[PDB]
Amino acid sequence: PVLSFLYRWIYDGELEDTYHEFFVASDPTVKTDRLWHDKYTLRKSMIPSFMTMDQSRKVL
Amino acid sequence: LQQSLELKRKMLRDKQNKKNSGQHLPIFPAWVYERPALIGDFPIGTLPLASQESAVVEDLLYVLVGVDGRYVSAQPLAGRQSRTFLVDPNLDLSIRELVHRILPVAASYSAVTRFIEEKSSFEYGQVNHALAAAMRTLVKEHLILVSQLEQLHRQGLLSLQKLWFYIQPAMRTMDILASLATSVDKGECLGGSTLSLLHDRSFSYTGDSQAQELCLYLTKAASAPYFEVLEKWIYRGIIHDPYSEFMVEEHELDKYWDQRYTIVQQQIPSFLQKMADKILSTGKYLNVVRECGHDVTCPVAKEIIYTLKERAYVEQIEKAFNYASKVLLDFLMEEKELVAHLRSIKRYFLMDQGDFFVHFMDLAEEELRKPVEDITPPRLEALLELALRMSTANTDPFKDDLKIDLMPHDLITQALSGLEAFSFDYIVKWPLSLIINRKALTRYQMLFRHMFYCKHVERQLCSVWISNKTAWFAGAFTLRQRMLNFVQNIQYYMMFEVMEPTWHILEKNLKSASNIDDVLGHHTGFLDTCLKDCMLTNPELLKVFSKLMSVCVMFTNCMQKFTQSLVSGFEATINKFDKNFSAHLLDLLARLSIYSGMASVISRLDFNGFYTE
């Protein structure tokens, strides 16, 4: 499940979590270039342990 | 169990402290230890021998698989024990001995079962888990035998003698396992200790054909998870121990080049103890190439397997070690090459350019002679760049590491003006910490300052002769002829016997030497001899050299004031200096002749033998 979301995150950029099965979460912004600085931030509790934190930052 | 949980509680924090990307290690739940069924072993006298025999052989067959029978009953589990068993006093004496022959294997089984389901806990590391798993496979066959024996016993084909007869291999196997289990538990054994212990319990039997399979199997099984950690360290160069069991440890804390990877004696297996240092060196060498760029992995076959009575596990590591050292050496000799980095230190410190100095001494003789506190650091660096552009060291690409460092003295243990306090500071790159060192930089600086003082006095002594000729006395003519023709010859000796021969041999060490721990030693030896064969780290320094140089600087100071507007006062102080100088020159020749190579510098200093003492 997680890997399917992860292959729609690096190929479509959609979280595909409904109960936080993925680490990235989305805050609705004003959508005038404040997407980049506020919208996606890491949740460090749902990063899979076989995935390293460096990769988790990079896929964002 | 109780006593093992303490060991786990220590080692979990020990391994957690190192980790910064992992998480806390899960332990087995509480219920698993609690049950006495998920862990290992927790008128009648008048009847004939056959009924008593059938009953006792069934109960004994029961206690083999870890459940109590009727007559024999395992005494209750509490802590670590070697188990003791009761028997009823209703049995005949023949049966009472014949049971007691068998009870060793039951007591051994009890220990092995507790060992297997305890040392599968996570803190012990992967090798101990694999030891428990191989013992688990061995425990499995015993149940097969017991289950066949019940079918035999129903048909009237089991008694104590037959049972004992059948279990003759199994009792010996279980006994050797019991020795290993108690030696691994009682003190702390994790990593290479419980891998060496099985390599030396394979030399307590030099041949059986039963124990051979057992020890070879347990070693080969337990060495695979150690090899898992090992093969990422020798071929790739990263440790990645998920549990600290490996021989080389990394604790994070420029210089982190052999200080980040240390060694722990227990974690080394005995069959790799001879190669332990080489196994440490490989990953250290391949680590340093990764940070500049391009991770390299060895194309070499990565299959290494433990063999009893063969050392086939040697040659793969040997080839990998050779390839590894070659890759670091080749990487350096093609980019970040040694014959530029060392060659520029030679070019300025050891003065392969004397054109980088002939401008600089003439240009900055006034502004160096001021006191060291008076002189500001930027002025030196700027004037240095002027003389760098006048010199042809400008066309050398490495001239960008000429800096300022002011230093107190080089006549302290084994100056006060800008000259002889002045030094350069060389800065090197990351993989040049394994050759070029901080201690080596410190020792190079003093060498330059020594030669710098000797060049300063040469400038003074030539100035006196050229000014003194006007288009008074000849007493200072011969004194100056004995000073200049002293200091020039110390340069001729100190260079053309120590420096250039050994440097040209060191270029033959940088074609024929296949690793880095040769080159490091060769370099250190050249520096240590280029100090020790001179007056630098001589134990009493030969202090007469500093005294003679002091008489030189006083003489040239007085001789520059040859201009009148008393000739006798100058003549008297020059002769006082002449006594002070000639005595110390003879004292130098004597003090060096007694000290332990002499005849070369003595014949250089005097050849006629006008003075011979």
Tokens standing for residue B425:
């500071």
DSSP B423: E
3-state SS assignment for residue B1: coil
- Alpha-carbon distance of B588 to B545, in angstroms, equals 7
User: In chain A, which residues have their Cβ closer than 8 Å to the Cβ of B23?
Assistant: 49
- Alpha-carbon distance of B317 to B304, in angstroms, equals 8
Looking at the complex, does the CB of residue A52 fall below 8 Å from at least one CB of chain B? yes
Contacts of B146 (CB under 8 A, 6+ apart): B61, B64, B65
- B24: closest chain A residue by CA: A49
Nearest C-alpha of chain A: how many angstroms from B26? 13
Strand partners, B261: B250
Contact of B404 with B385, CB cutoff 8 Å: no
Contact of B64 with B143, CB cutoff 8 Å: no
The DSSP H or E segment spanning B9 is helix B2-18
**B328 vs B25, B337, B512, CA distance in Å?**
37, 12, 15
Tokens standing for residue B162:
């037959």
Per the listing, tokens 């520096």 go with B527
- B22: closest chain A residue by CA: A49
- The vertex-B201 CA angle with B196 and B207, nearest 5°, equals 135
Q: Which residues of B465-494 are buried (b: 16+ CB within 10 A; e: fewer)?
A: eeeeeeeeeeebeebbebbbebbebbeebb
Residue type for B40, please?
Answer: G
Residue type for B168, please?
Answer: Q
B423 φ/ψ angles, rounded to the nearest 5 degrees: -150, 160
Strand partners, B262: B249
Strand partners, B86: B73
Alpha helices by DSSP H, listed for B27-167, are 30-34, 49-64, 93-100, 103-116, 126-154, 160-166
Nearest C-alpha of chain B: how many angstroms from A49? 7
- Alpha-carbon distance of B476 to B465, in angstroms, equals 10
- Alpha-carbon distance of B333 to B331, in angstroms, equals 6
Contact of B64 with B159, CB cutoff 8 Å: no
Contact of B408 with B417, CB cutoff 8 Å: no
What is the CA B351 to chain-centroid distance, rounded? 35
Residue type for B322, please?
Answer: N
Looking at the complex, does the CB of residue A45 fall below 8 Å from at least one CB of chain B? no
Per the listing, tokens 């000799």 go with B333
Strand partners, B420: B417
Rounded to a whole number of angstroms, the CA Rg of chain B reads: 40
Contact of B297 with B327, CB cutoff 8 Å: no
The DSSP H or E segment spanning B86 is strand B85-86
CB contact under 8 Å between A52 and B21, yes or no, is: yes
Contact of B60 with B54, CB cutoff 8 Å: no
Looking at the complex, does the CB of residue A53 fall below 8 Å from at least one CB of chain B? yes
- Alpha-carbon distance of B496 to B10, in angstroms, equals 62
B406 φ/ψ angles, rounded to the nearest 5 degrees: -100, 135
- Cβ atoms within 10 Å, residue B597: 12
- Cβ atoms within 10 Å, residue A39: 14
Q: Which residues of B12-21 are buried (b: 16+ CB within 10 A; e: fewer)?
A: beebeeeeee
CB contact under 8 Å between A53 and B23, yes or no, is: no
CB contact under 8 Å between A53 and B21, yes or no, is: yes
Contact of B125 with B190, CB cutoff 8 Å: yes
Looking at the complex, does the CB of residue B20 fall below 8 Å from at least one CB of chain A? no
CB contact under 8 Å between B23 and A49, yes or no, is: yes
Looking at the complex, does the CB of residue B565 fall below 8 Å from at least one CB of chain A? no
Q: What is the 3-state secondary structure (H, E, C) of B541-553?
A: CCCHHHHHHHHHH
Looking at the complex, does the CB of residue B21 fall below 8 Å from at least one CB of chain A? yes
Tokens standing for residue B210:
């039963």
User: In chain A, which residues have their Cβ closer than 8 Å to the Cβ of B21?
Assistant: 52-53
- B25: closest chain A residue by CA: A49
Tokens standing for residue B566:
């008393």
Contact of B545 with B535, CB cutoff 8 Å: yes
Looking at the complex, does the CB of residue A49 fall below 8 Å from at least one CB of chain B? yes
Interface of B with A in 434-453 (CB under 8 A): none
Q: On the CB side of B53, how many CA atoms lie within 13 Å of its CA?
A: 17
User: In chain B, which residues have their Cβ closer than 8 Å to the Cβ of A49?
Assistant: 22-23
Rounded to a whole number of angstroms, the CA Rg of chain A reads: 12
Tokens standing for residue B133:
């798993």
**B241 vs B8, B48, B272, B445, CA distance in Å?**
17, 63, 18, 42
Contacts of A22 (CB under 8 A, 6+ apart): A2, A5, A6, A9, A15, A16, A46
After which residues do gaps appear in chain B, with C to N over 2.5 Å? 42, 253, 414, 471, 565, 596
- Alpha-carbon distance of B453 to B421, in angstroms, equals 10
Tokens standing for residue B139:
């425990």
The terminus-to-terminus CA distance of chain A in angstroms comes to: 18
- A52: closest chain B residue by CA: B21
**B63 vs B70, B95, B521, CA distance in Å?**
10, 17, 65
Per the listing, tokens 């009870």 go with B103
3-state SS assignment for residue B417: strand
- Alpha-carbon distance of B63 to B87, in angstroms, equals 12
- Alpha-carbon distance of B456 to B549, in angstroms, equals 10
The experimental method behind these coordinates is cryo-EM
Nearest C-alpha of chain A: how many angstroms from B240? 13
Looking at the complex, does the CB of residue B23 fall below 8 Å from at least one CB of chain A? yes
- The vertex-B474 CA angle with B471 and B479, nearest 5°, equals 115
- Alpha-carbon distance of B31 to B28, in angstroms, equals 9
Q: Output the CA torsion B373→B374→B379→B383 (10° steps).
A: -100
- Alpha-carbon distance of B598 to B100, in angstroms, equals 86
Interface of B with A in 168-207 (CB under 8 A): none
Tokens standing for residue B605:
């200093």
B262 φ/ψ angles, rounded to the nearest 5 degrees: -115, -175
Contact of B301 with B239, CB cutoff 8 Å: no
Per the listing, tokens 């350096």 go with B332
Size of interface A-B (CB pairs under 8 A): 4
Nearest C-alpha of chain A: how many angstroms from B193? 29
What number of residues does chain A have? 60
- Alpha-carbon distance of B229 to B241, in angstroms, equals 6
**B79 vs B3, B75, B83, B174, B180, CA distance in Å?**
8, 12, 11, 20, 18
Looking at the complex, does the CB of residue B414 fall below 8 Å from at least one CB of chain A? no
- Alpha-carbon distance of B506 to B531, in angstroms, equals 16
Looking at the complex, does the CB of residue A18 fall below 8 Å from at least one CB of chain B? no
B567 φ/ψ angles, rounded to the nearest 5 degrees: -65, -30
Nearest C-alpha of chain B: how many angstroms from A31? 34
The sign of the CA dihedral B531, B534, B539, B540 is: negative
User: In chain B, which residues have their Cβ closer than 8 Å to the Cβ of A53?
Assistant: 21
3-state SS assignment for residue B405: strand
Contact of B380 with B363, CB cutoff 8 Å: no
Contact of B323 with B300, CB cutoff 8 Å: yes
Burial bucket for residue B54 (CB in 10 Å: 0-12, 13-18, 19+): middle
DSSP B75: P
Contacts of B399 (CB under 8 A, 6+ apart): B344, B388, B393
Q: What is the 3-state secondary structure (H, E, C) of A6-56?
A: HCCCCCCCCCCCCCCCCCCEECCCCCCCCHHHHCEECCCCCCCCCCCHHHH
Burial bucket for residue B178 (CB in 10 Å: 0-12, 13-18, 19+): buried
- Alpha-carbon distance of B64 to B169, in angstroms, equals 15
Q: Quick one: which of B491, B453, B475, B469 has its CA closest to B555?
A: B475
Tokens standing for residue B164:
């004992």
- A54: closest chain B residue by CA: B21
Contact of B267 with B194, CB cutoff 8 Å: no
